[PDB]
Design a protein around this ligand. Structure first.
Ligand code: HEM
Ligand SMILES: CC1=C(/C=C/C(C)=C/C=C/C(C)=C/C(=O)O)C(C)(C)CCC1
Length: 435
């Protein structure tokens, strides 16, 4: 069939519009205005079509196996490793998906709580003592601490080079894949080498011990493929590195967003508080207690809606396709943009406004088309850790609101940069007031 390809500029050979993608907060919106709802570009040497909205998301998460193959930018793939779920395909992917899910079972999450709440309260106490808190970097310390603790173990967490290395590793994930020591990418390459060497040490320690499936690392050590074979060491290291990155980076964004938004909407903050008051907290807080928070549930859906931690995903077309009148050529990439979908005014009337009532029983977002709220993606690659994320968001939201009000200091830049997750430019300057 003789259909046109989408409008859009490819730019220079290979380089294309990669620099705009990596540096402009404007990328998708600029090309939507200039080119329309479906546009093409070139990124990291690949021709890419950007799509968004319920129907485009439906398309991308339908008859997927025969059409769409998950991928990531060249820098991301190299730094994740060939043995990570994010970089696995087909039968291997299906298998590790079932293996990893066991780390996030309803009851295993329930068992994460005590250590998680202990790490959470520890930080709140410190921040409550301070005058001004520059919050964003603090949230990064905390979320790493929770992830290292719950996925690996407590003595692992107090060990002191791990965080600095991860921070450097993260900075190169979405960058120019230039393998020199004076680039963000080469520094992340070196960070990855140092981290794997440590995780290898951490793994060899755990193997000379009675089998425990308390955490993610123990779960992976116990895991067997369909041919009853263990995961290799290189796979073990790539898999924990991913879980620690995802558990750390995404949650840093979600919680700064929550602190940002409930910072600016003190009425919503009070309704959350009113909810946790019709219960009975103390320090006594169980997994079944957090399941009694329907209104907080709504706020957290809406935080993720307004400021999605993960901007989008990428797929290679392995079949030739068409969508809304365009040829989607075999071997080109498609990118689904969660940020664009969540800013659709048809899906989200007054998209710029923070309104939890969209997720209230009969609200606008409840009878939207499928694939309208996609903070965790959908189809075959839908976030595997979503309930770990929701757990940590709910506990943090709960402990923070029960103990403190807070003020976002006047004259700061609250504007959001994405390297590679939304963060406020001036790192969220606050004062907490104890209750
Ligand atoms: C609110 C926080 C989070 C958000 C918004 C989020 C978002 C996403 C999205 C959009 C995808 C799909 C990307 C694609 O289409 O390929 C994904 C996949 C994934 N997520 Fe999450 N994520 C979050 C937290 C977590 C956590 C806490 C973990 C566990 C440590 C995690 C682990 C993963 C993994 C391993 C994948 C790859 C799945 C696959 O390739 O099949 N994420 N996530
Ligand atoms: C790599 C990777 C992850 C992080 C994705 C991020 C942080 C990308 C943001 C997308 C952007 C920045 C796209 C755009 O703007 O178009 C998650 C946690 C899902 C785990 C699977 C592998």
């Amino acid at each position: 069939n003789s259909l046109p390809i989408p409008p859009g500029d490819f730019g220079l050979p290979w380089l294309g519009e990669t620099l705009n993608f990596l540096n402009d907060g404007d990328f998708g919106k600029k090309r939507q205005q200039q080119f329309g709802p479906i546009f093409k570009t070139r990124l990291f040497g690949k021709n890419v079509i950007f799509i968004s909205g319920a129907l485009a998301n439906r398309f991308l998460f339908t008859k997927e196996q025969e059409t769409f193959q998950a991928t990531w930018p060249l820098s991301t793939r190299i730094l994740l490793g060939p043995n990570a779920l994010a970089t696995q395909m087909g039968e291997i992917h299906r298998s590790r998906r079932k293996i990893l899910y066991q780390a996030f079972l309803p009851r295993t999450l329930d068992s994460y709580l005590p250590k998680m709440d202990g790490i959470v309260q520890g930080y709140l106490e410190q921040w409550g003592k301070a005058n001004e808190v520059i919050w964003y970097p603090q949230l990064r310390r905390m979320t790493f601490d929770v992830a290292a603790t719950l996925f690996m173990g407590e003595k692992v967490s107090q060990n002191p080079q791990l965080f600095p290395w991860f921070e450097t590793y993260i900075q190169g994930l979405f960058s120019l894949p230039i393998p020199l020591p004076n680039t963000l990418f080469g520094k992340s390459q070196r960070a990855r080498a140092l981290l794997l060497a440590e995780l290898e040490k951490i793994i060899k320690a755990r193997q000379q011990q009675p089998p425990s499936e308390e955490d993610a690392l123990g779960i992976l050590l116990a895991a067997r493929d369909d041919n009853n074979q263990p995961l290799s060491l290189p796979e073990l290291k790539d898999q924990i590195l991913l879980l620690l990155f995802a558990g750390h980076e995404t949650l840093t964004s979600a919680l700064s967003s929550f602190c940002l938004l409930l910072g600016q909407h003190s009425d919503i903050r009070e309704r959350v508080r009113q909810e946790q008051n019709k219960l009975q907290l103390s320090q006594e807080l169980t997994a079944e207690t957090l399941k009694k928070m329907p209104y907080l549930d709504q706020v957290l859906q809406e935080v993720l809606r307004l400021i999605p931690p993960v901007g989008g995903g990428f797929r290679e077309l392995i079949q030739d396709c068409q969508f809304q009148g365009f040829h989607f050529p075999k071997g080109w990439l498609v990118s689904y943009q969660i940020s664009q979908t969540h800013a659709d005014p048809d899906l989200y009337p007054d998209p710029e406004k923070f309104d939890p009532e969209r997720f209230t029983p009969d609200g606008s977002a409840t009878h939207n088309p499928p694939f309208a709220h996609v903070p965790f993606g959908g189809g075959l690659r839908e976030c595997l850790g979503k309930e770990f994320a929701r757990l940590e968001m709910k506990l943090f939201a709960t402990r923070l609101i029960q103990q403190f009000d807070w003020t976002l200091l006047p004259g700061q830049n609250l504007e959001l940069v994405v390297t590679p997750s939304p963060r406020p430019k001036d790192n969220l300057r606050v004062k907490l007031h104890s209750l």
